Design a protein around this ligand. Structure first.
Ligand SMILES: Cc1nnc2c3ccccc3c(-c3ccc(N4CCOCC4)c(NS(=O)(=O)c4ccccc4Cl)c3)nn12
Length: 113
Protein backbone atom coordinates (compact mmCIF):
# COMPACT_ATOMS: atom_id res chain seq x y z
CA UNK A 1 0.00 0.00 0.00
CA UNK A 2 3.00 2.44 0.19
CA UNK A 3 3.51 5.30 -2.24
CA UNK A 4 6.41 5.69 -4.65
CA UNK A 5 8.06 8.41 -2.54
CA UNK A 6 7.67 6.32 0.71
CA UNK A 7 9.26 3.28 -0.98
CA UNK A 8 12.17 5.39 -2.29
CA UNK A 9 12.77 7.25 1.00
CA UNK A 10 12.62 4.04 2.92
CA UNK A 11 15.33 2.66 0.63
CA UNK A 12 17.50 5.79 1.06
CA UNK A 13 17.02 5.67 4.84
CA UNK A 14 17.92 2.00 5.08
CA UNK A 15 21.04 2.47 2.92
CA UNK A 16 22.25 5.43 4.93
CA UNK A 17 21.44 3.90 8.30
CA UNK A 18 23.56 0.82 7.29
CA UNK A 19 26.57 3.12 7.60
CA UNK A 20 25.83 3.65 11.33
CA UNK A 21 26.20 0.09 12.77
CA UNK A 22 26.61 1.42 16.28
CA UNK A 23 23.29 3.30 16.17
CA UNK A 24 24.67 6.73 17.11
CA UNK A 25 22.17 8.44 14.73
CA UNK A 26 19.21 6.09 15.42
CA UNK A 27 17.36 8.06 18.08
CA UNK A 28 17.50 11.58 19.54
CA UNK A 29 20.75 12.40 21.30
CA UNK A 30 20.20 13.20 24.97
CA UNK A 31 22.27 15.57 27.14
CA UNK A 32 22.98 12.58 29.40
CA UNK A 33 24.81 11.00 26.50
CA UNK A 34 26.21 14.23 25.04
CA UNK A 35 26.57 16.93 27.67
CA UNK A 36 25.21 20.34 26.74
CA UNK A 37 23.89 18.99 23.44
CA UNK A 38 20.66 20.94 23.65
CA UNK A 39 22.56 24.23 24.20
CA UNK A 40 24.42 23.77 20.90
CA UNK A 41 21.68 22.05 18.80
CA UNK A 42 18.44 24.02 18.29
CA UNK A 43 16.85 21.59 15.77
CA UNK A 44 17.70 18.00 16.58
CA UNK A 45 17.22 15.21 13.96
CA UNK A 46 17.83 11.46 13.89
CA UNK A 47 16.94 8.40 11.79
CA UNK A 48 13.96 7.42 13.91
CA UNK A 49 12.34 10.83 13.47
CA UNK A 50 12.92 10.60 9.73
CA UNK A 51 11.43 7.12 9.54
CA UNK A 52 8.33 8.30 11.41
CA UNK A 53 7.97 11.15 8.95
CA UNK A 54 8.23 8.78 6.00
CA UNK A 55 5.58 6.44 7.47
CA UNK A 56 3.35 9.38 8.37
CA UNK A 57 3.39 10.85 4.83
CA UNK A 58 5.04 14.06 6.09
CA UNK A 59 7.63 14.34 3.29
CA UNK A 60 6.04 15.75 0.11
CA UNK A 61 9.32 15.70 -1.74
CA UNK A 62 12.68 14.02 -1.68
CA UNK A 63 14.17 17.54 -1.20
CA UNK A 64 12.36 17.71 2.23
CA UNK A 65 13.85 14.39 3.29
CA UNK A 66 17.30 15.54 2.15
CA UNK A 67 16.92 18.67 4.32
CA UNK A 68 16.31 16.55 7.44
CA UNK A 69 19.13 14.20 6.57
CA UNK A 70 21.55 17.09 6.06
CA UNK A 71 20.32 18.66 9.31
CA UNK A 72 21.12 15.46 11.21
CA UNK A 73 24.67 15.33 9.78
CA UNK A 74 25.24 19.11 10.22
CA UNK A 75 24.19 18.86 13.86
CA UNK A 76 26.84 16.18 14.51
CA UNK A 77 29.47 18.31 12.69
CA UNK A 78 28.42 21.29 14.87
CA UNK A 79 28.27 19.72 18.34
CA UNK A 80 31.39 17.59 17.84
CA UNK A 81 34.91 18.79 17.13
CA UNK A 82 36.57 17.51 13.90
CA UNK A 83 38.79 14.88 15.59
CA UNK A 84 35.89 12.71 16.88
CA UNK A 85 34.17 9.53 15.59
CA UNK A 86 30.81 11.43 15.41
CA UNK A 87 32.04 14.34 13.26
CA UNK A 88 33.96 11.96 10.94
CA UNK A 89 31.06 9.53 10.50
CA UNK A 90 28.58 12.39 9.90
CA UNK A 91 30.82 13.77 7.17
CA UNK A 92 31.06 10.35 5.43
CA UNK A 93 27.32 9.69 5.63
CA UNK A 94 26.46 13.17 4.39
CA UNK A 95 28.76 12.80 1.37
CA UNK A 96 27.31 9.39 0.47
CA UNK A 97 23.73 10.64 0.90
CA UNK A 98 24.37 13.74 -1.17
CA UNK A 99 25.69 11.52 -4.07
CA UNK A 100 22.97 8.84 -3.75
CA UNK A 101 20.23 11.44 -3.71
CA UNK A 102 21.71 13.87 -6.30
CA UNK A 103 19.37 15.99 -8.37
CA UNK A 104 20.49 14.14 -11.55
CA UNK A 105 19.73 10.70 -10.06
CA UNK A 106 16.34 11.83 -8.75
CA UNK A 107 15.47 13.22 -12.18
CA UNK A 108 16.36 9.82 -13.75
CA UNK A 109 14.20 8.01 -11.16
CA UNK A 110 11.24 10.33 -11.77
CA UNK A 111 11.50 10.02 -15.58
CA UNK A 112 11.60 6.20 -15.37
CA UNK A 113 8.06 5.87 -13.95
C1 LIG B 1 24.69 11.36 16.52
C2 LIG B 1 25.70 11.99 17.46
N1 LIG B 1 26.25 13.18 17.33
N2 LIG B 1 27.10 13.42 18.47
C3 LIG B 1 27.04 12.32 19.22
C4 LIG B 1 27.67 11.98 20.44
C5 LIG B 1 28.59 12.85 21.04
C6 LIG B 1 29.15 12.47 22.27
C7 LIG B 1 28.80 11.25 22.84
C8 LIG B 1 27.87 10.36 22.24
C9 LIG B 1 27.33 10.72 21.00
C10 LIG B 1 26.38 9.88 20.33
C11 LIG B 1 25.92 8.55 20.76
C12 LIG B 1 24.54 8.38 20.67
C13 LIG B 1 23.98 7.17 21.03
C14 LIG B 1 24.79 6.15 21.54
N3 LIG B 1 24.24 4.90 21.90
C15 LIG B 1 24.25 3.92 20.77
C16 LIG B 1 23.80 2.54 21.23
O1 LIG B 1 22.57 2.68 21.99
C17 LIG B 1 22.69 3.48 23.17
C18 LIG B 1 23.06 4.91 22.75
C19 LIG B 1 26.20 6.32 21.60
N4 LIG B 1 26.89 5.27 22.14
S1 LIG B 1 28.24 5.42 23.04
O2 LIG B 1 29.30 5.90 22.20
O3 LIG B 1 28.50 4.04 23.47
C20 LIG B 1 28.00 6.40 24.31
C21 LIG B 1 28.83 7.51 24.46
C22 LIG B 1 28.67 8.41 25.51
C23 LIG B 1 27.68 8.17 26.46
C24 LIG B 1 26.82 7.10 26.34
C25 LIG B 1 26.98 6.22 25.26
CL1 LIG B 1 25.90 4.81 25.21
C26 LIG B 1 26.73 7.52 21.26
N5 LIG B 1 25.88 10.22 19.12
N6 LIG B 1 26.14 11.49 18.64
Amino acid sequence: ESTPIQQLLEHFLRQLQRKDPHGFFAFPVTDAIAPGYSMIIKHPMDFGTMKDKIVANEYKSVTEFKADFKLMCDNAMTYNRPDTVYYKLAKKILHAGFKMMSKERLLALKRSM
